[PDB]
UniProtKB/Swiss-Prot annotation:
Transmembrane segments: none annotated. GO terms for cellular component: box C/D methylation guide snoRNP complex; cytoplasm; ribosome. Signal peptide: none annotated. Multifunctional RNA-binding protein that recognizes the K-turn motif in ribosomal RNA, the RNA component of RNase P, box H/ACA, box C/D and box C'/D' sRNAs. GO terms for biological process: box C/D snoRNP assembly; ribosome biogenesis; translation; tRNA 5'-leader removal. It comes from Methanocaldococcus jannaschii (strain ATCC 43067 / DSM 2661 / JAL-1 / JCM 10045 / NBRC 100440). Pfam families: Ribosomal_L7Ae. This is Large ribosomal subunit protein eL8. The keyword Ribonucleoprotein applies. Belongs to the eukaryotic ribosomal protein eL8 family. It is found in: Cytoplasm.
Amino acid sequence: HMAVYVKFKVPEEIQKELLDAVAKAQKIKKGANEVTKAVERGIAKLVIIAEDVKPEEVVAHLPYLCEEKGIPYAYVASKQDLGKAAGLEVAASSVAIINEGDAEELKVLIEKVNVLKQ
């Protein structure tokens, strides 16, 4: 695979961690338009982007925006799965965690991602 917008590989074990962060979150934003607003306003603490978004242009601006705003981001395989972790019955291309369920887990998972992306 790897779409152009997928800038680093996130293995399955950290993908699960990401999904589980999303499911236990207290407040999220869902979908590219809401996610992009939340990064632009500086309320996202972590952005999670599906790898299988088509058209890819829906999410292709997100890694750049996140990097330019200092916001951590990473990937999961499935937008279906992402939408179910976010409490939906439809897919989500992207999720932003606004208020997380476990602070300490978020800070460990954000570092894990830093490392992946080096």
